[PDB]
From a paper:
[name] organizes the rotationally ninefold symmetric cartwheel, an early assembly intermediate of centrioles that participates in establishing their symmetry and diameter. High-resolution crystal structures of zebrafish and C. reinhardtii [name] fragments together with biochemical and biophysical characterizations demonstrated that two dimerization interfaces in [name] mediate this oligomerization: a coiled-coil domain that forms a rod-like parallel dimer; and a globular N-terminal domain that forms a curved head-to-head dimer. [name] is a highly conserved protein that is found in all eukaryotes that have cilia/flagella during some of their life-cycle stages.
The asymmetric unit (ASU) of the crystal contained three molecules that were virtually identical to each other (139 ± 2 selected pairs superpose with an rmsd of 0.70 ± 0.13 Å in secondary structure matching). In this dimer, the β-hairpins formed by β-strands β6 and β7 pack antiparallelly against each other. Phenylalanine 257 at the tip of this hairpin is inserted into a conserved hydrophobic pocket that is constituted by the helix-turn-helix motif and the base of this hairpin in the B-C homo-dimer (formed by chain B and chain C in the crystal). In the Lm [name]-697–274 crystal, the A–A homo-dimer (formed by chain A and symmetry-related chain A) shares the features of the B–C homo-dimer described above.
Author numbering:
A (entry chain A), B (entry chain A): 130 to 238, 242 to 271
Write the structure that this text describes.
């Protein structure tokens, strides 16, 4: 049951500081499967791509083994099964044009090995970060 | 016009890591006035106290001079006049029992010279931080 829960396009404000950002469409992909040391750990894969650029490929791979730490650090209320569903609900609503939330992706440093994907909500008073995830480049 | 905008009591989850937290009533106090190098800079003072303990006194003093940096770093939409009003609205609603938000105050390190006051909202999916402020002990 290695299932794709989301494969879609979303607008993202991207930047490598100190450069100023651009807003552009990115592919986003969320899949559950198996991995880890003996091939049996449940994983959640979150991938971000640029259709117009192959070098742009960043991934977070989250193992159930590390979830408790991850959960505590982000103050998540959902369990490992719930986590990717929650994420997908948000991302799908943003893709549909049907959400109050925005996406930002900030690279470190081209020669960037990682970026931080943020889900943001702008209230009357400020922008509020709902979640941040670190995604690593490869391939 | 050095005016007190809020003087009240609020429940706060306090902790000095690695100790576990307690929830307890704290005095909170927000005042606008003047200060800075020549006595003319507008300031916002946010004070946290413990009625049952004099050594517990922490303050943030925010000068208009530094607001732009502070604004940008927290992604605030309000200006310097608006900022303390917004903060007070939140704190007063929490004091009244009439808010979806909570307060946390995490000390560094008794021998703590500072803590971070957080305004938190628990959604169905996680706890979301709306704002954090660093307050310094003195006196």
């Amino acid at each position: 049951e290695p299932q794709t829960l989301l494969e879609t396009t979303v607008m993202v404000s991207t930047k490598m500081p100190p450069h100023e950002p651009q807003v552009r469409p990115l592919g986003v992909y969320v899949r559950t499967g198996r991995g880890g040391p003996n091939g049996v750990t449940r994983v959640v894969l979150v991938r971000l791509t640029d259709p117009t650029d192959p070098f742009f490929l960043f991934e977070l791979e989250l193992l159930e083994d590390d979830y408790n730490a991850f959960k505590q650090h982000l103050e998540l209320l959902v369990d490992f099964h719930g986590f990717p569903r929650y994420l997908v609900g948000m991302l799908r609503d943003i893709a549909d044009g049907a959400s109050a939330y925005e996406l930002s992706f900030v690279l470190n440093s081209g020669d960037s090995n990682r970026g931080t994907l943020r889900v943001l909500e702008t209230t009357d008073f400020k922008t509020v970060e709902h979640i941040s995830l670190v995604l690593l480049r490869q391939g």
